[PDB]
Amino acid sequence: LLRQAHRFIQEGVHPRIITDGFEIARKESMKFLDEFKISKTNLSNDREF
Amino acid sequence: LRAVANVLKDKNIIPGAGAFYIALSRYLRSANMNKLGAKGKTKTGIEAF
Amino acid sequence: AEALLVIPKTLVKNSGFDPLDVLAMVEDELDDAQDSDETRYVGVDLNIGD
C-alpha cells in the first residue's frame, strides 16, 4: 500500500487525505463483507466439506 | 486445528484463492463513480486501496 | 491516458496551484456535461485556479 501511495506523495498529495480515504473504503468494505460472506450450518454432516 | 475450529465457532466462511480480494477491488472502483458522496481528493485514496 | 495529464498538471504546478484540485474540478464538470446533453468546453484558469 505504501508503494501505490508513493506515486501520490511525489505529486504533492497530503498523507492525511491518503489515510482518510482508506478509512472510508474500509467502512464500505465492511458493508460488502456482510453480503459476500456465506453462513455455514453447525450440522455435523459438514465433515465432507 | 485453529482454522477448523473457527468454522464451527463462527458460522460465516469466505472463499480463498483471491476470491475476496479481486471482488472487493473491482466493486470499490466502480462504486466510487456512482456514489460521489465523499470528496474529489478521496478518489486517490480509494483507487490506491 | 494518464501520461497526457502531465501538461495540465505541470502548468498549474509552476504557478503554485495544487495540481490535484484542478483535476477534481474538471473531471466532475465533464461528468455533468453528458447528463445535460450539451457540448461544454472546459479549460484551466491559471489566475483564479478553477
Angle between helices A2-9 and A15-36 (to 10 degrees): 140
Q: Cβ of A21 and B13 within 8 Å?
A: no
- Rounded to an integer, what distance in angstroms lies between the CA atom of residue C33 and that of residue C37? 6
Residues recorded for chain C: 50
The end-to-end CA distance of chain B, in Å, is 32
- In angstroms and rounded to an integer, the radius of gyration of the C-alpha atoms of chain B is 16
Pick from B15, B13, B49: which is nearest to B29 by CA?
Answer: B49
Q: Chain C residue with minimal CA distance to A17?
A: C20
Cell of B16: 480463498
Q: Helix H segments across B1-49?
A: 2-9, 19-35, 42-48
Method: cryo-EM
How many Cα atoms within 13 Å fall on the side-chain side of residue C22?
A: 23
Cell of B29: 472502483
How many Cα atoms within 13 Å fall on the side-chain side of residue C17?
A: 17
Touching C: B residues 8-47, CB under 8 Å: 36, 40-41, 43-44
Please give the distance of CA B1 from its chain centroid, rounded to a whole number: 26
Angle between helices B19-35 and A15-36 (to 10 degrees): 110
The end-to-end CA distance of chain A, in Å, is 35
Q: Chain C residue with minimal CA distance to A13?
A: C20
With beta carbons less than 8 A apart as the criterion, state whether B48 and A21 touch: yes
